[PDB]
């Protein structure tokens, strides 16, 4: 079986996806973590980018139409961006970056690079990412230049697939909307330049494609005794912590559950006392849980817990009073 | 003008909503904060509730169909819940809580109370919330009992409106799906009870209605010199912090912007040096920013900043090194 078939079998088995395709309990968490990271690094982390959410009663058009409004209430001037999570019925994280046409090309390259680095910063092997520029044959009527980030999914024939497209649509969008709506959307310069209709650089990433890329790239099988493991970035892992009492003994449970409640205040935690500890470690590793917290009888007097890191499996026993902080620093976000 | 007209004018003016209706830059942040709080207190904060996301190609049905799968991969037994953000084209935060029929009524009351408290815990005046039980005339064919939480929006005639419905749909849903799909979804008991098809308690809250209720309830006008203010809970405010240098002097900006960058790592921050400080304080108050951080020339040597709290307007000057923590403790989430 191919890598894709293996990962899909795992995803169905552990509830990442359910055959229908619908996202199961882990799939929703991974999807929302991906969306949160995209919004964080695109909207809230950038002063020149603000968000918007439009209705698609039956998508990027909803941004252009509201351009004027955004310029007024948000008090933004080019270069600046408007981001959105558009239900293209698959979701798509898209952004329209309005810039002076003179800089259009420079900005384009910027967003071609930044976006790529984004994926790399979340744990994707750069060797599994590449750039594919559309020739004039592909270039849409409005797009002067189009560059697709492509990920090595592992298909038959061509193993690469589009993951995100960054296009230079020029001034076609705003000009069309101005002509059709009878409203001037021009930012004619009165400061060291001439009149222009803002050019648009459009990064658009299919959320499903992003999740598939992260899931496939995180897969690993390392020894002997083989171990299937999703090496997710901590910010993307569906489950951040696993509170695993050493046994079902009624002494460990009342304290391990209190610790799990403390942790659930902040992160999504999974509590499991079923069976042997090694099986539970393998369970958590299969779904990329970055840390496991084990409570044993020695904790009833020593008042500590064993923290096991996913990839290395190295264990460190630390005071139960500090666990939260010890995890926060390591979980980020 | 009515309270609703006033709040709507403010929302359009400040970009909460744009006339089309679409959410502007602040509206998206408020909406996502509401959704995050709902998911946090319903899914990640409860071990007996897990999430799911289904496709609605043209909503609660998608949950029932996947019930079996969830019971297998999630390893859950009744009483337990499955939550979802269903695109009913308006979004709706819904949950299906499967329970043994014997407890169905008790659990029902629980979710009638808990949900209500949820709103109250996020800053809604309990006096503006009420319960409305549907008579048998209203009770749907499948619903034995139906209770709507209603909020005092301020309409004409009847000023109340549905905000969230909590229904006891009995075993109609799973029984229908079993008959139609040829799959047994029964949890026939083999432990101190008899055979049953899990009963369903359904809390469903319209996200738009929730956002409208929060926006309306947060509105206030307090003196003299009147001050319009959205008294949002810190977890719901679209903007958590406002870095406001005392003036555009080139000495304050390079440091205030560094502080704003530090804060943007964590929260959504708004930087504004335009005009007088009082006007900027009023701007931030109009949209419910819980804290304003002012940098003045005294900071260039004292290395401190003035933190102004929204409601009280009380100011406290604290070291710029501690600001993040000082805000974290006060912003929650
Ligand atoms: Mg921004
Ligand atoms: Mg849960």
Residue numbers in the entry:
A (entry chain A), B (entry chain A): 2 to 21, 32 to 69, 164 to 193, 209 to 343, 351 to 460
The authors write:
Both Mycobacterial and human cells express the α2 subtype, and notably, the GlyRS gene in humans encodes one product that serves both the cytosol and mitochondria, which has obvious advantages for the design of selective inhibitors.
MtrGlyRS was readily produced using standard protocols, and 37.3 mg of protein were purified from 2 l of culture. Despite isolating the monomers during gel filtration, the two synthetases crystallized in the canonical dimeric configuration. Remarkably, the interface visible in the electron density map of the MtrGlyRS apoenzyme is quite limited. Interestingly, the theoretical dissociation free energies estimated for the glycyl-AMS-bound states exceed 24 kcal/mol whereas the value for the apoenzyme model having more missing structural elements is less than 1 kcal/mole. These flexible features could offer strategic opportunities for achieving selective inhibitor binding on the basis of the “flexible target, rigid decoy” model. Partial priming of the enzyme for tRNA binding is most evident in the series of MtrGlyRS structures, which includes the apo state.
